[PDB]
């Protein structure tokens, strides 16, 4: 298993515009267009993203292109963020991945501002962190999702996802 994977399992796959757990109009692997209300916004965003007009729908290649880009911007947010970075450093290659499924998920302020969990991830307080970890709002929108990243911060396993 490996991060691809292992998003793709929490995000799925949609080829046309879809909302998102948050009602924002997403597409393909978990790739949000915008957070406005509109579908016309949403297409356009869509098209420039594509460079075509997509008319709202994209092919499976497409929707892994943008994926592997939202992979990899994750990664180097990570890796700029000074808050992140000494984190990602300290983990094994498992808990790695888990980072940055939320990065992913939730943006690198947004996981830079779960201060406790850092510290408590950096010092490798496993269950100290998963407890902490499920106190957010995040694990009360989203909790088998968020279940599934903390048993992986918790074991270093991939066990959530087989
Ligand atoms: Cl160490
Ligand atoms: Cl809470």
Same mark, same amino acid.
């Given at each position: 298993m490996n991060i691809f994977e292992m998003l793709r399992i929490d995000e799925g796959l949609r080829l046309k515009i879809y909302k998102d757990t948050e009602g924002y109009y997403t597409i393909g692997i978990?790739? /949000? /267009?915008?957070? *406005?209300? *509109?579908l016309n916004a949403a297409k356009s965003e869509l098209d420039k993203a594509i460079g075509r007009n997509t008319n709202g729908v994209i092919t499976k290649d497409e929707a892994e292109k943008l994926f592997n880009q939202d992979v990899d911007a994750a990664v180097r947010g990570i890796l700029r963020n000074a808050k992140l970075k000494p984190v990602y450093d300290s983990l094994d290659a498992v808990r790695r991945a888990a980072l940055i499924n939320m990065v992913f998920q939730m943006g690198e302020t947004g996981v830079a501002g779960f201060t406790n969990s850092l510290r408590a991830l950096q010092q490798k307080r496993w269950d100290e962190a998963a407890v902490n970890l499920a106190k957010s709002r995040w694990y009360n929108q989203t909790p088998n999702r968020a279940k599934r990243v903390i048993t992986t911060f918790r074991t270093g396993t991939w066990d959530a996802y087989k």
């Open positions: 978990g790739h /949000l /267009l915008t957070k *406005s209300p *509109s």
